[PDB]
Amino acid sequence: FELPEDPKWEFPRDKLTLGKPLGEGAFGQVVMAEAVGIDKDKPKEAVTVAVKMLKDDATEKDLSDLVSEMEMMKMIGKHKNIINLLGACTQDGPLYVIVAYASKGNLREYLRARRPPGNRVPEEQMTFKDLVSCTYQLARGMEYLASQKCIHRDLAARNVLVTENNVMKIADFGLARDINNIDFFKETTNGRLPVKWMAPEALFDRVYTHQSDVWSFGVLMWEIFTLGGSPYPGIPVEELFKLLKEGHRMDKPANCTNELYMMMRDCWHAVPSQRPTFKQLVEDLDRILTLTTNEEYLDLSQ
Amino acid sequence: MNAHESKEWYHASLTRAQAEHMLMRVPRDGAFLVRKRNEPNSYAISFRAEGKIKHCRVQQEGQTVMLGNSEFDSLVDLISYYEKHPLYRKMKLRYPINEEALEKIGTAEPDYG
Ligand SMILES: Nc1ncnc2c1ncn2[C@@H]1O[C@H](COP(=O)(O)OP(=O)(O)CP(=O)(O)O)[C@@H](O)[C@H]1O
Ligand SMILES: [Mg+2]
Ligand SMILES: [Mg+2]
Question: Read out DSSP for A245-288?
Answer: HTT--PPPPTTS-HHHHHHHHHHT-SSGGGSPPHHHHHHHHHHH
In whole angstroms, give the CA distance from residue A285 to residue A70. Answer: 30
* Cβ neighbour number for residue B6 with a 10 Å cutoff: 8
Give the end of a domain, one of A53, A76, A101.
Answer: A101
Same-domain check for residues A110 and A96: no
8 Å CB contact between A75 and A178 = yes
Which residues of chain B make contact with A298, given a CB cutoff of 8 A? 54-56, 88
Ligand 1 site residues, Cβ closer than 6 angstroms: A 22-23, 25, 28, 30, 50, 52, 83, 99-102, 105-106, 158-159, 161, 171-172, 174
Number of domains in chain A: 2
Same-domain check for residues A40 and A176: no
What is the signed CA dihedral for B95, B96, B101, B107, rounded to 10 degrees?
A: 50
In whole angstroms, give the CA distance from residue A244 to residue A249. Answer: 7
Task: Check which CATH number belongs to the domain holding A59 and give it.
Answer: 3.30.200.20
Determination technique for this entry: X-ray
Residue boundaries of the structural domains of chain B: 1-113
In whole angstroms, give the CA distance from residue B90 to residue A188. Answer: 62
Same-domain check for residues A86 and A153: no
From the list B44, B68, B88, the residue facing A301 with the nearest CB is B68
Q: Decide if B55 and A298 are in contact by the 8 Å CB cutoff.
A: yes
Ligand 1 center–CA B5 separation, angstroms: 58
Q: Measured between CA atoms, how close is B112 to chain A, in angstroms? A: 25
* Cβ neighbour number for residue B100 with a 10 Å cutoff: 9
| H-run or E-run covering B81 | helix B75-84
Looking at the DSSP bridge assignments, the partners of residue A160 are A170
Q: Phi then psi for B53, rounded to 5 degrees?
A: -90, 130
Show which of residues 66-125 on chain A sit within 8 Å of chain B, judged by CB atoms.
Answer: none
Please name the residue whose Cα sits nearest to atom 27 of ligand 1.
A174
In a domain, residue A296? The reply is no
Same-domain check for residues A33 and A140: no
In whole angstroms, give the CA distance from residue B27 to residue B29. Answer: 7
Give the end of a domain, one of A101, A121, A154.
Answer: A101
Same-domain check for residues A136 and A269: yes
CA distances to A227, A248, A257, A284, B113 from A224, rounded to whole Å, are: 5, 20, 13, 17, 37
Q: Around A221, how many Cα atoms within 13 Å sit in the side-chain half-sphere?
A: 31
- Which of A205, A198, A176, A216 lies closest to A77, judged by CA? A176
Question: What is the CATH number that goes with domain B1-113?
Answer: 3.30.505.10
Q: Which amino acid is at A34?
A: E
Same-domain check for residues A5 and A112: no
Ligand 1 center–CA A23 separation, angstroms: 6
| H-run or E-run covering A217 | helix A210-225
In a domain, residue A137? The reply is yes
Same-domain check for residues A162 and A273: yes
Residues in contact with A69: Cβ distance below 8 Å, sequence separation at least 6, in sequence order? A97, A172, A173, A174, A176
Task: Check which CATH number belongs to the domain holding A160 and give it.
Answer: 1.10.510.10
8 Å CB contact between B72 and B33 = no
The answer, for A300 touching chain B at a CB cutoff of 8 Å, is: yes
Range of the domain at A117: 102-290
Same-domain check for residues A117 and A43: no
Number of continuous H segments (helices) and E segments (strands) in chain B: 3, 7
Give the end of a domain, one of A101, A126, A147.
Answer: A101
Q: Decide if A298 and B56 are in contact by the 8 Å CB cutoff.
A: yes
8 Å CB contact between A209 and A271 = no
Ligand 2 center–CA A158 separation, angstroms: 4
Pocket test for ligand 1, best of A20, A106, A155 (most atoms within 8 A of CB): A106
CA distances to A146, A182, A294 from A178, rounded to whole Å, are: 10, 9, 39
- Which of B41, B49, B47, B38 lies closest to B15, judged by CA? B38
Same-domain check for residues A120 and A77: no
Same-domain check for residues A32 and A69: yes
Same-domain check for residues A109 and A95: no
Experimental resolution (Å) = 2.6
- List residues of A with catalytic annotation: 154
In a domain, residue A125? The reply is yes
Same-domain check for residues A158 and A86: no
